[PDB]
Amino acid sequence: EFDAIKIALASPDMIRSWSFGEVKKPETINYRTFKPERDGLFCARIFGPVKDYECLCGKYKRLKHRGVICEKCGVEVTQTKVRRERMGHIELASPTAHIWFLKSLPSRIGLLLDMPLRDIERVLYFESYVVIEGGMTNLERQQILTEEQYLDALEEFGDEFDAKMGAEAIQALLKSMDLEQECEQLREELNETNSETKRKKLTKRIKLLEAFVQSGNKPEWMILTVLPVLPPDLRPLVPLDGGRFATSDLNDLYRRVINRNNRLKRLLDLAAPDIIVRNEKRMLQEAVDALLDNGRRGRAITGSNKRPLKSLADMIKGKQGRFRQNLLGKRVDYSGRSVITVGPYLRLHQCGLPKKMALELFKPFIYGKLELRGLATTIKAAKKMVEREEAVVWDILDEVIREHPVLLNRAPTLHRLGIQAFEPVLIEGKAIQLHPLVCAAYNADFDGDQMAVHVPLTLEAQLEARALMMSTNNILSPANGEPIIVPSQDVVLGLYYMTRDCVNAKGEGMVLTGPKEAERLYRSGLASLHARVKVRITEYEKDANGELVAKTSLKDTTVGRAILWMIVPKGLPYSIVNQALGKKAISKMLNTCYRILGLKPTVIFADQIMYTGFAYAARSGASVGIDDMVIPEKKHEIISEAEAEVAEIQEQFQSGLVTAGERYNKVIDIWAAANDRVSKAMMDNLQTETVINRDGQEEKQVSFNSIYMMADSGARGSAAQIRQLAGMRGLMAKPDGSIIETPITANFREGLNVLQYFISTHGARKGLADTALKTANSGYLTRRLVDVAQDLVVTEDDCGTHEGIMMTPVIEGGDVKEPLRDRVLGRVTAEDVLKPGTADILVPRNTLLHEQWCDLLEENSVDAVKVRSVVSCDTDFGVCAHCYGRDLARGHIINKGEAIGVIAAQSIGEPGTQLTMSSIQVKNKGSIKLSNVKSVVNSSGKLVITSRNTELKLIDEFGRTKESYKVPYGAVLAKGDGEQVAGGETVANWDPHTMPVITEVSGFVRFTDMIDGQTITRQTDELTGLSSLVVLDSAERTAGGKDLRPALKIVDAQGNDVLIPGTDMPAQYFLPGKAIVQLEDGVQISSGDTLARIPQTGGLPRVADLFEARRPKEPAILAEISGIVSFGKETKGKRRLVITPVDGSDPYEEMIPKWRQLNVFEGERVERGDVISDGPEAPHDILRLRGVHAVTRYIVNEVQDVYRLQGVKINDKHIEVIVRQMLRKATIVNAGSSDFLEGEQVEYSRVKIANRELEANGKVGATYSRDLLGITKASLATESFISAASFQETTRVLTEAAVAGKRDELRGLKENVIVGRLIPAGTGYAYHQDRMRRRAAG
Amino acid sequence: ETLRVDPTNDRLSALVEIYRMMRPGEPPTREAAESLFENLFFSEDRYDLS
């Protein structure tokens, strides 16, 4: 057993202590007798014997002597398995550089020595010298030279200085430096130069030096002098059938190293010239680099078939490395697969399994059972009995599979309902039989799909397959709490045909005694299923304490509903079957049956519904013919009446009355209108066109047309497809996105042209090609979500906070899109909310809001509840059960030990394949309410407001907000506040291409703040004669003029600036360029007059950008702190802006380009967070200025905006889990005796539990800021290197973990999957807990 | 205006600069550059527009 995993650098002595001897030559094996040659790469004296308990010569054998070492051949007598464990080594004749610690950016050598990469890569190729010692001279350490300057220094200084070349120089540099002294001298000499640009690199270098000092490594071990050699059985040399051999590539890469090292050991004995020894050292360096990482430092060495050779680093990383191919998913025994087909007679817990598959998968069970009954003497006779297929084998098989579940699985597995457990029923034939009700969780059908079969072997696996995964526990969805077993295609059609009615049906009028008599009359041929009758019916209810009370009546109904009522269980009202049922009504039936009665009645009721639907669909006789597609008789005239209009709109273009663009854009809509007319004529001629007469004469009723019947019931189809069957097809797009002019005026019942067919193929291929190239983006997103969320598990029962989040309905974009009931069902209340009076307590203030509480909330009217959330949980390393709420697939409080992260990721990722990739009116009557407002009366008897960010709400009968808008700034409110206005009434009027900005108070306007020669012209409208000093563009700019940006201001009878009530305010605002102002000089105005005006992607990409926390390319600018705004020093790179607190310091001022139109004038007072411009907001700013709840709310609303637009239902805590995982890091601002640095990035939980102990015994803690990382940057920044290494970028993760000296504690799920242990979630949660208790014991 | 960002003044400097581009890491001579440029697009045995 073990508890952790470590990683570090390896010294030469460590590499020599792993090995069993030195490899000295490239010999692999002998060419006549294929035996391993001595001292080569497959040597049997170093690496172990090639047969069990035999030496190589043949002298020793037979397991008598087990530890002897033969004296002839040196092989020891032992088992050959040891050729997978023993290593060797190679002693290099000159040191070489490890390529990982040199060329993985940032380089660790260049960061440790503070040298550029160019200088090092020049000293390493014998191309320049480097000074190691200065002696007493002008030259200093790490100075770079050339040959001539080296000769000059030699003949001038002589012996005192020291200069070298190659990896020996760099090893001497790394070996001589002192780390503690250097880091401490980086400490006190940073505070002066703690400027940011130097701050980042200085603190990075400081933490690197400190890591080397504390970890125990030495900086010179990054230069190799001894090399290890992998065991032979992991790089084998193997014969094929035919005498041919096959080999690994590491052999090819090791031979080059060995026989370039031997040549250098020769040249160093012949005492050759240095121009040749240098070439050898370069070649040795290149060979070792290609053995470690092939294509990194140059061209890739290729083999004799012109493909690059694979290296030690390509066997670990990538989609086909060890991690993703052999450790996170494997191939398994006891498994099979086959084609699936439907069996409609099965129960919900049953599957049909062929006899031959089951005989193969269950062989050891059958052998043991056979030799227990004495039917066979030994296992080898049992084998032949089974192989002959005697008759008793088939009777042993039937009692082996009795009460043995079997797991079925279909790929791709998008969520956990892709694997389910069944009980097998032996069949003849070769295809597997599946129940018709589970094909919706699998996404399966019978056009050729195939499924896989797995057999659990042990007692615990059988218990878990029965209790957790059996198909009769999985009726609800885990994403939303809805049922998943709804009936799809012919259950629906049969139940809909049996509960319809008809006029003048045979047997109309009778009075019957009960359902049994209606059935007996239908079977006999006396009544019809659609006949209107009167039946006596008994129904039950429960208002007693768990008991049922009955009551009988006479009801008016049809025969078919009375027949169906014999299926419904006791305790449901009759009004559920008295409709004409469709898919929605049947789903309602199943859901109310689950809410009232429970699980087992529901799983019996679903089966009964399926059987009776199939039976009556069969008896109906529904078919499809060519006459069932009815084309309306007035299409041929709508078409001509559109063609005449397009002709008479072409001839207004041939005579120069209309442009080409408007001509096209008018033909488009005069064809769209005719298409809509045709479609509505078609649909009205088809839907109720039945004239069936009655006892005296004719009347109308709904149609019994087959196509209409299967479209209207929800079995198969829609209106958009009958439109193409019987209407016209419509308008087609080019592959560009442009729409062709002439539409397709034909349908499929009539037949297309060559040309209409040709132009219809474009969109078909475009859709088919988008599907295949979207599935990859969806899968990659799911994998990143699973990797960020995998280690989050419900750990505790109650953390005890009072925090929460405020849930209200969403009413924007129109009507109420999401009620309050759908957003609090299941959550736990954060505070003791009270119905809209005072002290209307419903709560112990921890209350699981089940359906009765939601009904109580809706019989009153409350529209805001404070609830609990995971992004505010106080538990570290997990969540508590009360902050999470309800288990959405079980219907009760979540259990402690549940893996909520994998469920969140799977629920968000599964639907990703369906994503696409001038005046205010009021509807209904209610009060009008305003917020965030500041008002003034107008000159024309109306309301105006001087607020930019106000909100206008509509109040209902009881005071629940039904609609909410916001008005543009400067707009004039047509009517005031507190009004009960009816619908159809406008409340505010704004211009569609303009917005005015108004004065403050009635005063006297003066033309000031502008001269002639300024950004002002004297441009007067020559035809009408109205002009103020008008503000200009930058094309008419006079740079010397913009000394003061023009604005016409308001003065008193004093000639000076007007009072503003409440504060000594300047009454007038200076406006940016190109302003339209035509207000007269000398013609004064009143308060609120027109002084100036303002002239003027969804799908998977947006979801990925939200979770990755991208930054928009036009981000809005917000107020850093609260203060009075003004323009700053005006350094004209581009504009400068400052704000000033009324009490505090104001060193903060920064840059704004003049393209960015400002909406805050020099007299404004802003609070923290409000906008200074418009544009999409950036989430890091929302987290810095406003808190955590603001960025949570923004992210969840912007994500749900995309899913709701398509009809996809996902609960909202599944996004809160991801948002919690993106917020795990904190950054330190002021340490204060906290053992942390001053701008280091730490885990948030470490800071929290450090400050909770410092503050415990009376000390000052640390101060910090929160951070927001994307999902792939937060997956890689976790504190376990095995999860990060197995996710992505294995090279960077492993080099950084190696030089840092990290360790791993195996706390997530993936760490325990890699080493084959029980995960800490589920039925394995208790086990780990007990182990953790022993961690406190020792 | 293109002519005013060139560091070249005549045929030899241009050939030397092309040589420095195609084969970095050695100084050329008056014949190596001319032969390299005459091999690229103007010799029927290393170029063929079909």
Partner: peptide, 12 residues
Amino acid sequence: GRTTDPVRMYMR
């Protein structure tokens, strides 16, 4: 030196 090839580094 704007090159990393050892055959050119030799022939130079």
